Structure 1
Amino acid sequence: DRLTQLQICLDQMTEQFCATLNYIDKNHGFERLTVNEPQMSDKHATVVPPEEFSNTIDELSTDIILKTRQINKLIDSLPGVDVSAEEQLRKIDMLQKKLVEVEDEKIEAIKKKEKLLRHVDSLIEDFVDGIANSKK
């Protein structure tokens, strides 16, 4: 979960590092220099208009920033880490103790509830004896 999101975001950072250059290295436009811009043979050049090319540069330049901000939010959302381990081990031991104690408390409560149920049972057999000695 918390460890996987960092690896996923990193792999996305690399895939954006490559894919961002892939589009520009494949689809782009020429330049008029001082005479003309488009060549008579534009079969393999697949020249795209500068509008969609600029907007694509803006989007590919924005996605990496969004993912980077997501990385910042994730490294700031990770639980509080420590340079030492005695804290963690101490926490583990304490939690174990609490587990034992709460188990015992459960046992006691179950016992008491059993007793009460026995009592109200007793009441019910009283009633049954009543009606049984009654109607017949």
Structure 2
Amino acid sequence: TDRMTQLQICLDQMTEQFCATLNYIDKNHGFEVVPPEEFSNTIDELSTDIILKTRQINKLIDSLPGVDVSAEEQLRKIDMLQKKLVEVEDEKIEAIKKKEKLMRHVDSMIEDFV
């Protein structure tokens, strides 16, 4: 699933941001080389993205398909779909049989020069 992948890649980017933050905090000021009013700017811009990423992630999780569905069901829906496939294909052969049967009919009259 793509959504599941976007959720993985998203979580990946956030994990990195937490690291960039932890190490930026930790190393510079142990949270009490860069000036005070400076360490404050970045810290906010770094924690602002982390807040948005948390929203984004929660939305992806919400949009995951079959998120509120169990496994037992998924397996049923797959069996149900396979069965409908067999049927819809039986219908399709019939539809084609007939179309082809008709086309021959026309071809007949035409080659008959009529």
- Larger helix percent: 2
My pick for the range that moved more, 107-116 or 1-10, is 1-10
TM-score, with structure 2 as normaliser: 0.74
- Using a 3 Å threshold, how does the CA distance of structure 1 residues 105 and 29 change in structure 2: closer, same or farther? closer
Q: TM-score, normalised by structure 1?
A: 0.64
CA contact (8 A) 2:25 2:31 kept: no
**Residue ranges of structure 1 left out of the alignment (5+ in a row):** 32-47, 129-136
How much has 1:124 moved relative to structure 2?
A: 1.8
In structure 2, what is the equivalent of residue 88 of structure 1?
74
SS at match of 1:80: coil
Post-superposition Cα deviations, 1:18-57, rounded to whole Å, max 9, x if no partner, equal 21133344556999xxxxxxxxxxxxxxxx4544433212
| 1:68 shift after superposition | 0.7
- RMSD over aligned Cα atoms: 3.1
Gap regions ≥5 residues in structure 2? none
Query: Looking at CA atoms only, which structure, 1 or 2, has the larger radius of gyration?
Result: 1
Deviation of residue 116 (structure 1)? Answer: 1.6
How many equivalent residue pairs? 112
For 2:47 and 2:68, locate their aligned partners in 1 and report how far apart those are by CA, in whole Å.
36
Structure of higher RCO (CA pairs closer than 8 Å, 6+ residues apart): 2
- Aligned residue runs from structure 1 range 101-112, under 5 A: 101-112=87-98
Task: Report the alpha carbon displacement of residue 81 of structure 1 after superposing the two structures with TM.
Answer: 3.5
